[PDB]
């Protein structure tokens, strides 16, 4: 019902879509494709994480769910950024 929550939810879904594509292509050794999807995923993760979600009005199961989505997104953003830098610098094992 709050518009800030749907932004978080949309970012969560899109980020997963692109990071999953990135991981699929990465596992298949398609490193240029992977970097592409990872960068798109980063954009969505950043947006979802950027939404203020600890204010006074931010109460209830919806906001709680949104915060947990952002928790997940911050963790994944760290992992994607690491893998991206590794691929960009050609250090993939």
């Amino acid at each position: 019902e709050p518009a800030e929550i749907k932004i978080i939810r949309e970012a969560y879904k899109k980020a997963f879509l692109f990071v999953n594509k990135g991981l699929n292509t990465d596992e298949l050794g398609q490193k240029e494709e992977a970097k592409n999807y990872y960068k798109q995923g980063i954009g969505h993760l950043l947006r979802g994480i950027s939404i203020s979600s600890k204010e006074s009005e931010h109460t209830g199961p919806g906001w709680e769910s949104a915060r947990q989505m952002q928790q997940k997104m911050k963790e994944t953003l760290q992992n994607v950024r690491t893998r991206l830098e590794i691929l960009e610098k050609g250090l993939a094992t």
Partner: peptide, 16 residues
């Protein structure tokens, strides 16, 4: 059935 935890697992595996 979106599971971000599964993503983390796959990144860890790519390091091996």
């Amino acid at each position: 059935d979106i599971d971000f935890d599964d993503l983390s697992r796959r990144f860890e595996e790519l390091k091996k």
